[PDB]
């Protein structure tokens, strides 16, 4: 009913975090070997993905997903809510589930698409938390927001194999809030859910354990020749 | 029935489309939204925010701290202390909150502004010269030539007289941020007006720089930053 | 469907009808029309809003020195309230014997020293009854005012950067994947003495990185700007002092695993001593807590 | 809401520069061998269409391109802004981009088709341009409107081979705004961004050097015999 | 849920047709629109303008400047000077703004307004007669049967009966663009009136021709000008 | 979805809820429904306007000939005003002192002539005042008023074209790919003689098209009407005036990178001498800068 | 450390050549020499900053360079 | 700028002369007959705490050199 005027554009609404964040990109990668595939939900994969969620501390938004897939002749797919056991392979039991969220599509027909909303847990989801799951002398701590929640599990089977194997999971963020802004990192990633930019390039033999910041400032032979 | 038609475009699939989705987990209640400190709606606040400027980057100070501060002494005859040519592309300006928003974005619009900052003992003095040579102009190579452009004295003892507002002078209304002969901005440079005068001879000044966005800065055409690379997955 | 309860007007319709199979958030305006900067950021002055809750005295103790306080996020500190709040449990209010300042150890500032940290609220952990109120509650939330004090001669010279990072999380030393050690990260008031970087840091146990310029979480120095911050010229000033409202997701955390906050010291251009004798100089700390709650009363969480 | 009339159509109608200029014309084909495929986007490289825009000094349009391809299975295409570096094969990591806005689509199941809006950067797009973009004594001049934009470029990969390789570019000025307005061509264009109409013919051997004007100007036996 | 139909033509791809589409790059901001000298918003407001006619156009005068005008001088007994047959896909008119604007266009329709122009010095005189001989007669051969048909006097030193309208003389509403024998729009003559009289024997003329449409002019079915073609690849 | 703020009404409706994303452009209207010729093209007189603005005299230099002068796309030239402007600053208006008639080397027009040609503002860059604001500043704008003037007697016979070409790209002499040189394009005031065409004619360092009839970028001459333009015809005119606005799709731009005019001179018919003697008259072209306007001031951009 | 002044025009003559007649001398005298202190610094830059202010020309010509 | 040092007996500048060759100032004087300006002097010279010595600044019309 209501007519809901806004504008066509304005001068930095390319820059507003809705705009910023609110393009669909892909959050991971997996392979259909055996006919099942199986991908926990996160943005720490993809390096250029990651960089944009963490110019900001905290960020609430829902998700949807869009699953390219060159396979064919029919998929399913399972979400998995925490806390129970996920599908190991296709033919498995649990992939009959009363419950469980799950989606079947036929890859030729269309691209399928569906919303994962808020699931936070804290009222935002941390991008960056620096404390502990467990107390004090606790043997194994998780640091980071690993512990701070789960967004769930995307389970894939293919009930006719036919074609590729490749699953390709985009999401958008959308209805995005986000709060506290920091630094751009300045350092390519070395791992997930963490922090540390020391790259170690080597493992087997000599010269191991000369570790590499690499970072992106490059430089000039004069200051004043520029 | 009704008779639909499906245009071009209709089952594509693109990446920066706007839609409707239908929800998995319906029912679903997301957990309360209380009231965090420091909400920011738009990224374009963050280049409003000052942000020091690696002006000295060169084989040995970069990856230290020393990256971020030149040193003056005093000199019989005016040099020429500092040039920051104005890209966002460069190392200069792209590491900065200014410059790493603005390569996300293919071109923008607006005005710099660019602060000193001098840190020397209270009894040191000085007078400098801090000219921008709008598009189209050569690097001036001496005073005489930077003084006809855009320029402020920047005394110490007043620290009111820091920032230089590079002015928006160009053709076209945006500029391209990666650097290119078409568009280039200009060259913001930094001279001895008169001398840094120490408390005793042999003294050494410091000098720090910062660069933020003005309010009119603008851009558009959102890209992938090339501030950013994975050349292997992240395990 | 479902609706919901150079311009283009348009029809607000959910087809599916349900909030979030919404598609991306506009600016919505109920008649035609026909924000720039964000004062929130940039750190405001403190009487940038107002200066009627501020000579400053929390608690017994007592601060002379008040428009160059900072106030982080533009956000005065206040109690939770309610209606933002998880339990309906009243919390406790210790007021001004646990809202107080407390000076930590002086650390000297020499030439060549790199940095400094302190975690929030862990260098608090042995203070007084805000250090008790910590172990005998489950929760808590508390806003602080940091006030760093650095005086040398105007003969002295250079450059502090005092700044206070929401969740700042270290990187590992170096190489493997490793948790930085629960000990590395929660030092106590001594808080963290940045050695590096170089090839040679230990690597064990998780500790930290140690390298002043990514800050070490991997973003460089002077972006450290964007947070709440203030830069002790010794040319200008030798004092500082910023006041941080509780940032978090949650209302209550627990305050012993989870450190909101980090204060972080790092000399910008080093010291170097004048005419003077001087090469090194006492950099203090004073922590207030402010507007401090506690809830989920138990045995004392101490080991 | 609003019932806007208009007409069925007027007597010059079909000479309006919205009509005249508003059909979608090829404006380049490219071929997928090894899966990549890229298109700069310019109308220089086919003649007639670059013959109409070139009645006029100035353009302003926003354009919608369409992709006729005689491939399948899927695709991607990736509009690359100007300022950073496209992918240069397939299985390229920058496949993989936050930002960058791309389109997948299954060929069998329609044509794709987006718009780019108004990119020009100086108001209007430059037809003729008579100027250089360095200055006097530079080294290398580009002259004409090759520095005067970039309208992007289109990367295509094929993530199923399947099918042909033969991509076709449709893409149609709408929202046109023409200005200053300019003698038809009289001459078969020999390059891009170029305005010279010498052809060159040859090249290994004797005979060389001799060029052509190709111009569409044909005689008559007697004037008042006609 | 809502019995929609796809009739033929649906999934179709018309070039011609008219279709919204995605915007790739959404809350770009165009540069704004100035107010540029010359705007045109029809492509027929080119054919009114006057265009020089090569009305000479043979072995030797093509492909220069002398390919505009014709020679006249006094002779003792009127004669044909030139012919300008009436058609849109000829050399003669296919080369100008009008003719290149409706060779894009399968037929028309109006007037033709057809200016000549003698370029000689100011002690000449003569008395022409322009001639338009409308669908279905021939080319008259002799001045007699030239003026049968629509006619015009143009004589110097007047200059505002250069002009000769050709008028609109048609069975159907409009006529082929191509050339053919059923719409076939007939011929404009140029004869001597009395003479081309030098200031002295031996004297020498020299004719140039214009063409442009009048306002009633109409055009339609927009097409593949044949005044372009590529015969290769352009790199 | 949107909409947007024999005779067939229609719903206006963006689907896709933008501008851009609609379709081909119509022509609109309120209500029901129950143009041939552009005054703007084909020269107007600049009576065809108002003729207040004008016996000519700009800038202490004074023309005596005006309802014959061609008003080039009907357009008055004047100042950027303002928002159509891109920078704030406030431009500079040198006025009588830089706008004013300069006249140029004539060029003896001849038999066998083939034409002449001057790129605009680069004809004036060492005249003047005006000449000395190109370097000076970053950009600039301006209007011109050609006079050009060739006269004969009653003898003489032939005739000119004298055109004013926005952004007139010249072809390179022929064969390979190259740009036409930086300074073949720039010739000064002496403007660039047209020698060919021939197959002899030389190719190096980008030199410009010899070729008259095509306009040395590729379209015939006769179709050069559809510029503004006068045809300078012996046994009528003496001579010419055009006066253009400012073309460009930019409100300033360099001037000395970028001409953005073109006076060109083409004999149409030769020149025959009558029962005189004289095989060859002078050609003498005067341009006036007119509404010139200059910002972003630097050092001479000068070598 | 510094100084303004701000001079108007004055002259007898509404306005007078500029290349032949300087209408005025901006003379700088050390009236109590340089002495450092404690500091081994024994020399000081002077600068001089000129604004024209409020100019005006007339009669204009080829340039009166030489 | 200029040295100032022990033993520096003064400067002068004429103007508008001094301005000749300054920018489009310097310009207008040779292409323009006649001319009239006012201007605006700004001299700074900066030292230490512990300098010490005294300059005297004037601006002298019609200042004839003897």
Same mark, same amino acid.
């Given at each position: 009913?209501?007519? #809901?005027?806004?504008?066509?554009? !304005?001068?930095?609404?390319?820059?507003?975090?809705?705009?910023?964040?609110?393009?669909?990109?892909?959050?991971?990668? *997996?392979?259909?070997?055996?006919?099942?595939?199986?991908?926990?939900?996160?943005?720490?994969?993809?390096?250029?993905?990651?960089?944009?969620?963490?110019?900001?501390?905290?960020?609430?938004?829902?998700?949807?997903?869009?699953?390219?897939?060159? !396979?064919?002749?029919?998929?399913?797919?399972?979400?998995?809510?925490?806390?129970?056991?996920?599908?190991?392979?296709?033919?498995?039991?649990?992939?009959?589930?009363?419950? !469980?969220?799950?989606?079947?599509?036929?890859?030729?027909?269309?691209?399928?698409?569906?919303?994962?909303?808020?699931?936070?847990?804290?009222? $935002?989801?941390?991008?960056?938390?620096?404390? &502990?799951?467990?107390?004090?002398?606790?043997?194994?701590?998780?640091?980071?927001?690993?512990?701070?929640?789960?967004?769930?599990?995307?389970?894939?089977?293919?009930?006719?194999?036919?074609?590729?194997?490749?699953?390709?999971?985009?999401?958008?963020?959308?209805?995005?809030?986000?709060?506290?802004?920091?630094?751009?990192?300045?350092?390519? &990633?070395?791992?997930?859910?963490?922090? !540390?930019?020391?790259?170690?390039?080597?493992?087997?033999?000599?010269?191991?354990? +000369?570790?590499?910041?690499?970072?992106?400032?490059?430089?000039?032979?004069?200051?004043?020749?520029? | 029935?009704?008779?639909?038609?499906?245009?071009?475009?209709?089952?594509?699939?693109?990446?920066?489309?706007?839609?409707?989705?239908?929800?998995?987990?319906?029912?679903?209640?997301?957990?309360?939204?209380?009231?965090?400190?420091?909400?920011?709606?738009?990224?374009?606040?963050?280049?409003?925010?000052?942000?020091?400027?690696?002006?000295?980057?060169?084989?040995?100070?970069?990856?230290?701290?020393?990256?971020?501060?030149?040193?003056?002494?005093?000199?019989?005859?005016?040099?020429?202390?500092?040039?920051?040519?104005?890209?966002?592309?460069?190392?200069?300006?792209?590491?900065?909150?200014?410059?790493?928003?603005?390569?996300? &974005?293919?071109?923008?619009?607006?005005?710099?502004?660019?602060?000193?900052?001098?840190?020397?003992? $209270?009894?040191?003095?000085?007078?400098?010269? +801090? $000219?921008?040579?709008?598009?189209? /102009?050569?690097?001036?190579?001496?005073?005489? =030539?930077?003084?006809?452009?855009?320029?402020?004295?920047?005394?110490?003892?007043?620290?009111?007289?820091?920032?230089?507002?590079?002015?928006?002078?160009?053709?076209?209304?945006?500029?391209?941020?990666?650097?290119?002969?078409?568009?280039?901005?200009?060259?913001?440079?930094?001279?001895?007006?008169?001398?840094?005068?120490?408390?005793?001879?042999?003294?050494?000044?410091?000098?720090?720089?910062?660069?933020? $966005?003005?309010?009119?800065?603008?851009?558009?055409?959102?890209?992938?930053?090339?501030?950013?690379?994975?050349?292997?997955?992240?395990? | 469907?479902?609706?919901?309860?150079? +311009?283009?007007?348009?029809?607000?319709?959910?087809?599916?009808?349900?909030?979030?199979?919404?598609?991306?958030?506009?600016?919505?305006?109920?008649?035609?029309?026909?924000?720039?900067?964000?004062?929130?950021?940039?750190?405001?002055?403190?009487?940038?809003?107002?200066?009627?809750?501020?000579?400053?005295?929390?608690?017994?103790?007592?601060?002379?020195?008040?428009?160059?306080?900072?106030?982080? &996020?533009?956000?005065?500190?206040?109690?939770?309230?309610?209606?933002?709040?998880?339990?309906?449990?009243?919390?406790?209010?210790?007021?001004?014997?646990?809202? #107080?300042?407390?000076?930590?150890?002086?650390?000297?500032? =020499?030439?060549?020293?790199?940095?400094?940290?302190?975690?929030?609220?862990?260098?608090?952990?042995?203070?007084?009854?805000?250090?008790?109120?910590?172990?005998?509650?489950?929760? /808590?939330?508390?806003?602080?005012?940091?006030?760093?004090?650095?005086?040398?001669?105007?003969?002295?010279?250079?450059?502090?950067?005092?700044?206070?990072?929401?969740?700042?999380?270290?990187?590992?030393?170096?190489?493997?994947?490793?948790?930085?050690?629960?000990?590395?990260?929660?030092?106590?008031?001594?808080?963290?003495?940045?050695?590096?970087?170089?090839?040679?840091?230990?690597?064990?146990?998780?500790?930290?990185?140690?390298?002043?310029?990514?800050?070490?979480?991997?973003?460089?120095?002077?972006?450290?700007?964007?947070?709440?911050?203030?830069?002790?010229?010794?040319?200008?000033?030798?004092?500082?002092?910023? *006041?941080?409202?509780?940032?978090?997701?949650?209302?209550?955390?627990?305050?012993?695993?989870?450190?909101?906050?980090?204060?972080?010291?790092?000399?910008?251009?080093?010291?170097?001593?004048?005419?003077?004798?001087?090469?090194? *100089?006492?950099?203090?700390?004073?922590?207030?807590?402010?507007?401090?709650?506690?809830?989920?009363?138990?045995?004392?969480?101490?080991?």
């Amino acid at each position: 009913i209501e007519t #809901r005027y806004v504008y066509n554009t !304005n001068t930095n609404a390319e820059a507003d975090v809705e705009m910023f964040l609110g393009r669909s990109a892909l959050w991971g990668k *997996v392979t259909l070997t055996r006919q099942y595939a199986k991908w926990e939900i996160n943005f720490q994969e993809q390096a250029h993905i990651r960089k944009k969620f963490e110019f900001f501390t905290y960020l609430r938004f829902d998700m949807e997903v869009t699953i390219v897939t060159n !396979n064919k002749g029919l998929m399913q797919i399972m979400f998995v809510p925490p806390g129970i056991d996920h599908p190991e392979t296709h033919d498995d039991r649990k992939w009959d589930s009363a419950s !469980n969220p799950s989606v079947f599509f036929q890859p030729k027909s269309g691209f399928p698409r569906f919303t994962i909303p808020f699931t936070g847990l804290a009222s $935002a989801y941390y991008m960056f938390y620096d404390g &502990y799951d467990k107390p004090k002398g606790s043997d194994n701590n998780e640091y980071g927001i690993a512990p701070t929640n789960d967004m769930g599990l995307l389970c894939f089977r293919t009930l006719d194999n036919s074609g590729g194997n490749d699953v390709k999971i985009y999401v958008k963020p959308k209805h995005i809030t986000a709060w506290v802004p920091r630094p751009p990192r300045a350092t390519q &990633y070395t791992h997930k859910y963490s922090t !540390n930019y020391h790259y170690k390039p080597n493992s087997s033999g000599p010269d191991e354990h +000369v570790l590499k910041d690499r970072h992106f400032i490059k430089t000039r032979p004069l200051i004043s020749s520029a | 029935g009704l008779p639909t038609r499906l245009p071009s475009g209709s089952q594509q699939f693109m990446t920066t489309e706007d839609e409707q989705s239908p929800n998995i987990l319906p029912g679903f209640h997301p957990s309360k939204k209380i009231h965090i400190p420091g909400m920011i709606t738009n990224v374009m606040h963050m280049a409003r925010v000052d942000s020091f400027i690696p002006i000295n980057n060169i084989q040995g100070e970069v990856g230290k701290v020393s990256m971020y501060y030149i040193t003056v002494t005093k000199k019989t005859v005016t040099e020429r202390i500092l040039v920051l040519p104005l890209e966002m592309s460069n190392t200069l300006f792209a590491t900065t909150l200014l410059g790493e928003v603005l390569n996300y &974005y293919a071109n923008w619009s607006g005005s710099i502004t660019i602060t000193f900052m001098c840190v020397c003992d $209270a009894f040191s003095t000085g007078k400098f010269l +801090v $000219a921008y040579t709008p598009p189209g /102009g050569k690097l001036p190579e001496d005073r005489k =030539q930077a003084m006809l452009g855009v320029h402020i004295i920047w005394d110490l003892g007043l620290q009111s007289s820091c920032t230089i507002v590079v002015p928006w002078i160009s053709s076209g209304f945006y500029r391209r941020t990666k650097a290119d002969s078409f568009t280039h901005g200009g060259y913001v440079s930094l001279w001895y007006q008169t001398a840094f005068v120490p408390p005793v001879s042999g003294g050494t000044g410091s000098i720090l720089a910062t660069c933020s $966005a003005c309010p009119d800065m603008s851009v558009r055409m959102l890209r992938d930053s090339p501030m950013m690379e994975q050349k292997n997955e992240l395990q | 469907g479902a609706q919901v309860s150079s +311009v283009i007007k348009y029809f607000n319709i959910n087809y599916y009808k349900d909030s979030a199979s919404s598609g991306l958030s506009r600016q919505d305006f109920s008649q035609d029309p026909s924000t720039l900067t964000n004062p929130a950021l940039m750190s405001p002055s403190v009487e940038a809003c107002g200066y009627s809750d501020r000579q400053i005295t929390i608690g017994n103790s007592t601060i002379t020195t008040s428009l160059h306080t900072v106030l982080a &996020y533009g956000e005065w500190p206040t109690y939770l309230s309610d209606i933002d709040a998880t339990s309906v449990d009243k919390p406790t209010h210790p007021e001004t014997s646990a809202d #107080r300042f407390y000076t930590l150890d002086s650390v000297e500032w =020499q030439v060549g020293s790199h940095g400094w940290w302190w975690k929030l609220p862990d260098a608090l952990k042995d203070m007084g009854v805000f250090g008790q109120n910590m172990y005998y509650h489950s929760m /808590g939330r508390s806003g602080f005012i940091i006030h760093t004090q650095c005086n040398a001669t105007k003969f002295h010279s250079g450059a502090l950067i005092v700044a206070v990072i929401p969740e700042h999380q270290l990187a590992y030393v170096g190489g493997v994947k490793v948790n930085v050690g629960y000990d590395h990260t929660h030092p106590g008031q001594s808080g963290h003495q940045i050695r590096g970087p170089s090839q040679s840091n230990d690597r064990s146990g998780g500790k930290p990185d140690e390298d002043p310029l990514f800050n070490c979480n991997g973003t460089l120095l002077g972006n450290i700007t964007i947070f709440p911050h203030q830069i002790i010229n010794l040319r200008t000033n030798n004092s500082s002092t910023i *006041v941080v409202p509780y940032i978090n997701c949650v209302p209550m955390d627990n305050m012993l695993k989870h450190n909101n906050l980090s204060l972080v010291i790092i000399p910008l251009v080093p010291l170097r001593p004048g005419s003077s004798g001087i090469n090194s *100089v006492p950099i203090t700390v004073t922590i207030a807590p402010y507007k401090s709650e506690f809830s989920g009363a138990m045995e004392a969480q101490r080991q």
